[PDB]
Amino acid sequence: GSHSMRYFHTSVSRPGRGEPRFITVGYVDDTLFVRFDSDAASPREEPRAPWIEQEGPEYWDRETQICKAKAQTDREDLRTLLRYYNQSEAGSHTLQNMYGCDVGPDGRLLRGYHQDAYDGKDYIALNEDLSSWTAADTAAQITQRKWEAARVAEQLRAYLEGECVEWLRRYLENGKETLQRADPPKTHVTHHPISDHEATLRCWALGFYPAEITLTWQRDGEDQTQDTELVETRPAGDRTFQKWAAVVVPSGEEQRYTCHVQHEGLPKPLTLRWEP
Amino acid sequence: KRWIILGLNK
C-alpha cells in the first residue's frame, strides 16, 4: 500500500560532560534500517535491517559522512540557539529533526516532511507546500530567513520528490519479502476478574507488522469506544508489535462483548470473544 | 538515502 521513509535525528547537549550526543535512525515504514550514534566506538552509519546490507561501501561511506555532518551542524545549532533564546551554556538542550516522504501504492510522493524541534517543542517546519516555512517562534523566524535566503526549501523539495521517493522505492523492492509482507496479529481474549461484580476483558494482538492496527470492543455489536482502554502499541523487539484493548464489563455479561481487529495482514477483520 | 546540503545551519 502506502509507505514511508523517515530519518530521525537527536542531538542532546551535555555541558561539562563532553560534546553533544548525536543519534540518528532511519526507518522504512516501521522498520529500523540504519543508525548512527556519535557515541559508538568508531561511529559509522550502520545497517539495521538485512535488505539495506546490499548497498555498497560508497553508500555506507556517504551516509556516514552525512550523519557526521548532521551531528556537527547540530553542535553549531545548539550554540546558536543558546544565543537566540538567551540561554546559558550550562543547560542541556535537545535538537530534533525528522524528515522523509510518504509514497502512495503508485510509488509517487504523497507527502514529504522536514521538521525541527528545540527542547521538545516545534521550532521550524517545512510546510506541506514543500515550498514554505512555518517558524514556531521569534528565534525560529531568524532560521526561516536564513533558509529562505539560501533557497533550502527548493532543494529539500527536490530531495523529497526525487531521491527520497526513488530510494524508498528501491528499499521497498530490496526488502519486498519483509517490508511488503504484512504479518497478521495472533489474537486472543483474556478474562480478568476484578470482583464478584466485574471483570476485565482484554483483547490481545501479538506478533503483527506494521504497527498500525485497530482494536475495538463492541457490546451487542454497538460502539464501545470511550469505554475502551487501549495501551500504546509496543515493539516486541523483533520488528513486530503488540497492543491490547480492554473493557471493564459486568460479570456474567461477557458474552455481549466482541473484540474487533483490523490490520493490513488480515484478509478480513476479526471478531473475537472471550471463551466463556 | 539521506539528504544533505551545505549551509543548513539554524
Epitope: 552525512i66 557526521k68 555532518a69 556537527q72 553549531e76 545549532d77 | 549551509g7 545551519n9
Partner: T-cell receptor
Framework: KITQTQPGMFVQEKEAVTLDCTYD???????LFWYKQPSSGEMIFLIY??????QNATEGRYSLNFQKARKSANLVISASQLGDSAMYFC?????????????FGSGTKLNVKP | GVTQTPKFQVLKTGQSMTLQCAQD?????MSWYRQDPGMGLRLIHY???????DQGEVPNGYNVSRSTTEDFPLRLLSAAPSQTSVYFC????????????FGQGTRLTVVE
C-alpha cells in the same frame, strides 16, 4: 582538486569574460566558490554554487555557469570593469572532509584592457 | 565581517607574533590559511566552535586558541623564514557553511 587552466585572461572593458574552472570530486555533495583577490591582496568572496542547486548562481555581474555533468564551474563576469583586473580563485569544499578544507585553484589573473 | 590584523608584518627569525582575527557575525567556524605560490591555500588550524581547535594541513609552527567564538588568534611562537607567507583568517556560520568570508590577509615577512 580545482583546475583553472588559464594563468591569465584578458578582456576589453565593458565586454564579458568567462574564467574557466573544473573541479575533481567523487562526492555528490559539494560547493563551488569564487574569490577575487585584487592587487591589495584581500580575498573577496564573489559567488557560491551548491552541487544540488539547479539554478545557476548569480550575484551582481557574476554568474556561475555550473555544469555538473561537464564538471565545470566557470565564472562569468558581465560588463568587465577596470576594477575587475585581479586574481580569480575557483574553490570547492566537499563531503569527504565534511566540507572542512577549501580547495583553491591556481587562480586566473584577469587583465581588463581599456 | 572578519577583521584580521595586522595587514602587514615583518618578523625577525625566532620572534613570536600573534595574528589577530575577530568576526562580528556569530560564526561558529574559524580557520587560518596561508597562501603560498604553487601551494594553493593550505589550512593551518581551524575551530568548529569555542573551545575546539584542530590541526589543518600544516599546523606545525603554529598554535591557535578559541577562547570565544568571536576570536581566533594565530600564534607563531618562533618565527622561521619558511613561515614567510600570506595568511588568511576565514570564518563561516558552521563547518558546512557557505558564507565563507576571508580576512584582509596578513602579509608576513620573516627576515634573518
Amino acid at each position: 582538486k580545482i583546475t583553472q587552466t588559464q594563468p591569465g585572461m584578458f578582456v576589453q572593458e565593458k565586454e564579458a569574460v568567462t574564467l574557466d574552472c573544473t573541479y575533481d570530486t567523487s562526492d555528490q555533495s559539494y560547493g563551488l566558490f569564487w574569490y577575487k583577490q585584487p592587487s591589495s591582496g584581500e580575498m573577496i568572496f564573489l559567488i557560491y554554487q551548491g552541487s544540488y542547486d539547479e539554478q545557476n548562481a548569480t550575484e551582481g555581474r557574476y554568474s556561475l555557469n555550473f555544469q555538473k555533468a561537464r564538471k565545470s564551474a566557470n565564472l562569468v563576469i558581465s560588463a568587465s570593469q577596470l576594477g575587475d583586473s585581479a586574481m580569480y580563485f575557483c574553490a570547492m569544499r566537499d563531503l569527504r572532509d565534511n566540507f572542512n578544507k577549501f580547495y583553491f585553484g591556481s587562480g586566473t589573473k584577469l587583465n581588463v584592457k581599456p | 565581517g572578519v577583521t584580521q590584523t595586522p595587514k602587514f608584518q615583518v618578523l625577525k627569525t625566532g620572534q613570536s607574533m600573534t595574528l589577530q582575527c575577530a568576526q562580528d557575525m556569530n560564526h561558529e567556524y574559524m580557520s587560518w590559511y596561508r597562501q603560498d605560490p604553487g601551494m594553493g591555500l593550505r589550512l593551518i588550524h581551524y575551530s568548529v566552535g569555542a573551545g575546539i581547535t584542530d590541526q589543518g594541513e600544516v599546523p606545525n609552527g603554529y598554535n591557535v586558541s578559541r577562547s570565544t567564538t568571536e576570536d581566533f588568534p594565530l600564534r607563531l611562537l618562533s618565527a622561521a623564514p619558511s613561515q614567510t607567507s600570506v595568511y588568511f583568517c576565514a570564518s563561516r556560520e558552521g563547518l558546512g557553511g557557505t558564507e565563507a568570508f576571508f580576512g584582509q590577509g596578513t602579509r608576513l615577512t620573516v627576515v634573518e
